[PDB]
Ligand code: B12
Ligand SMILES: CN1c2c(nc(N)[nH]c2=O)NC[C@@H]1CNc1ccc(C(=O)N[C@@H](CCC(=O)O)C(=O)O)cc1
Ligand SMILES: [K+]
């Protein structure tokens with residue numbers, strides 16, 4: 038049945054025990070194979086609590102981690118102190134944890150590189166797995182092979198796909214040899230990282246010859262999204278077409294804020310559902326490090342989750358212990374598990390939100406104007422490398438009704454891939470709506486899927502060049518969990534008659550559903566839109582042929598969608614004529630079964646707004662209604678050359694607001710195109726350079742900080758705003774009157790032992806873009822080296838960062854060092870576990886120490902202290 042195009046390793050085929058088939062998630066068939074999933078049907082399995090906050094309780098020294106170089110790495114304890122890891126496992130098993138997690142989340146090349154252990158991930162993964170079996174096999178319990186998100190965000194360009202894929206592949210080998218009962222991807226922050234890690238571990242399954250179940254889990258930030266800005270609706274929509282088995286949450290902030298999120302996963306997911314909150318964020322109660330979630334409260338949460346919502350697996354994360362799991366194992370034993378929903382509503386998604394493929398009484402509209410062949414303006418800015426101009430175009434089609442966007446960079450004598458690699462990093466975070474990737478090259482689609490988050494659409498697969506290319510693209514759409522446009526062209530040519538369209542649509546449907554295991558709701562069948570208006574005879578019945586096929590295939594293929602490029606029906610006509618025929622063809626298509634269209638969104642006219650004599654002649658064209666004498670094409674052109682404004686459109690003045698308000702809205706909305714012209718307009722009108730910085734520019738920067746903190750703006754849009762502010766400062770900097778000085782300088786560094794840099798490098802970017810000089814010394818920096826930089830650079834303040842409670846004690850040591858060396862200058866501490874209370878405690882050592890919750894407080898503090 039297969040051809041050389043086929044590749045059913047990652048996604049799975051339509052036969053056997055593949056994760057997805059034509060009727061959705063394989064629930065009954067996969068349970069038979071995997072005893073973990075078999076038990077989820079029958080009973081709520083209990084997971085372990087934390088590994089790391091247990092390891093921190095122990096009296097651990099540098100020699101226990103094999104020396105000073107690796108002090109604080111959890112993964113080396115599988116080699117250097119295996120019994121300490123086992124001790125914890127055994128204590129959860131005695132509390133009643135039917136599943137435990139291998140101490141292997143940080144076991145990745147690029148994370149392990151920071152301890153000089155880059156070559157060692159497969160090793161440390163193997164050892165942590167073996168330890169876990171030796172505990173679990175005595176107690177008759179399952180082992181889950183934990184893998185974490187790393188230190189480097191792929192959507193924002195901190196690591197490539199290829200390296201991130203390399204790391205998850207080798208770490209999964211290590212687990213699969215060690216004999217894990219499932220792979221578990223956890224604490225995910227970046228929806229593209231999820232897809233990368235899922236495909237990786239599915240390949241490592243194909244290499245070692247053993248297939249285990251897949252459990253993927255995200256963390257939400259307090260604001261209510263993932264770090265990179267993905268909501269729960271989008272996260273789920275991305276996971277529901279991937280080869281996974283369980284979806285869920287871990288860590289985050291506690292059960293309080295996780296509640297509505299797990300309510301969503303529980304209601305809609307056709308997969309099983311996991312849920313593992315931490316004990317909330319730690320505090321310091323007179324020396325001792327305290328968590329506020331009691332075990333009695335965690336039982337009263339997991340009872341609600343398991344018995345009201347229908348959550349299958351329950352457990353804990355950072356700052357829970359054996360006492361938490363004890364009370365959880367009690368509360369859930371003998372509850373009858375609710376069966377998971379049978380089908381899932383078809384949707385796609387961007388980085389940030391999901392979109393239904395069925396729109397009620399309406400259409401999924403795909404803006405057509407990012408097409409090099411089909412838009413002079415796009416073509417020009419593509420070749421001129423005008424990034425701002427392309428985002429203005431893309432942004433513009435959204436404002437007019439675009440649910441998604443079509444992207445086509447192909448042009449004679451250009452490299453399609455070179456242009457794609459420039460563009461897609463920017464689009465991946467720029468766009469607020471999903472992409473449809475338009476290409477005849479399977480390698481162009483492949484590249485695109487390594488860059489674009491969410492769930493995507495591929496345009497198209499057909500049988501033009503045989504079964505190779507068809508199967509190639511169909512496997513690709515199965516793996517990345519993308520929707521597939523199916524065009525009706527076979528090896529003998531384009532399908533012109535209705536009988537030709539059905540035959541071809543029927544055969545492809547059969548390859549995709551039965552062979553490749555695709556759902557109907559994944560397919561959008563494109564029958565052909567040919568130009569009926571060019572002049573020729575044979576071409577007259579061709580829009581009719583297509584509408585009649587589509588109403589036949591709607592009845593014969595219940596689940597499917599249909600897509601058309603309706604702007605091709607009108608070729609060989611004037612702009613204004615084209616608009617009207619396209620608006621009418623679109624409406625008759627909806628009636629016959631069309632669910633989706635490729636259109637210029639803002640040039641769709643409602644049927645109410647079309648002249649009636651024009652409307653009826655449009656019908657006469659579309660359905661081939663031709664009397665002797667009466668030529669409906671001539672009368673249709675006659676009409677437009679007579680009636681002057683029959684389809685005229687001006688759209689203007691969206692930003693025609695007050696000048697100072699416009700400048701501020703430029704920062705908040707992140708719009709740089711036109712920025713410098715407006716800033717000049719303001720200077721000519723008497724506005725002083727330094728008044729514009731501290732007036733409308735600073736106000737929109739406070740507003741950007743106000744919205745982000747409340748969950749009303751996402752992280753990439755915050756980096757956009759600062760970019761607008763950067764350009765603004767560069768423009769007005771030459772013209773200012775009290776010249777001679779900068780705003781201020783901050784030496785910044787993560788502390789000795791602290792490996793994570795995402796939030797340090799956000800503070801760098803945000804402060805530098807606002808014209809603060811930032812000497813970023815990197816990670817693990819000793820205090821001796823910090824004060825060398827200070828003595829050289831004469832900064833206005835010192836900033837220290839680190840994620841953990843041990844980071845906070847190192848900062849206390851650094852203040853004791855700085856006090857005794859005689860330093861008096863301002864220090865600014867921040868960090869994920871660092872609280873406001875603990876810094877006020879530290880003021881007894883060093884008076885001029887301040888606390889930052891985020892980089893916008895650093896903003897505030899830098900302003901305040903520099904003057
Ligand atoms: C996902 C996550 C991770 C990621 C971190 C990804 C990264 N940042 O690179 C991973 C999984 C890798 C990680 C690891 C661990 N985790 Co963790 N993790 C989290 C989490 C959810 C925070 C997520 C995060 O990245 N936020 C986003 C970043 C951008 O925010 P940020 O770091 O806070 O930075 C911001 C501000 O603090 C501020 N800022 C930071 N520094 C500075 C400096 C200055 C000068 C200024 C002005 C501002 C400033 O600006 C930033 C943006 O505005 C928290 C819980 C929570 N909700 O906070 C736990 C948390 C940090 N993790 C914790 C733990 C226990 C661990 C591990 C030890 C677990 C283990 N299995 O052993 C390991 C670390 C091991 C090691 N090698 O050292 C604890 C720490 C407490 C403790 N020690 O008891 C927390 C608080 C969870 C808890 N107990 O409730 N973690
Ligand atoms: C055949 N097409 C098509 C497809 N994708 C699918 N699935 N099906 C199709 O039928 N992709 C490309 C095209 C649909 N897209 C387009 C895009 C623009 C114009 C168009 O009419 N462009 C104008 C120029 C506009 C300008 O430059 O301002 C033209 O005159 O060609 C037509 C179709
Ligand atoms: K756990």
Ligand SMILES: [Zn+2]
Pocket residue numbers: 038039040043044045050508552
């Ligand atoms: Zn095949």
Ligand SMILES: [Zn+2]
Pocket residue numbers: 287288289315354355
């Ligand atoms: Zn945690």
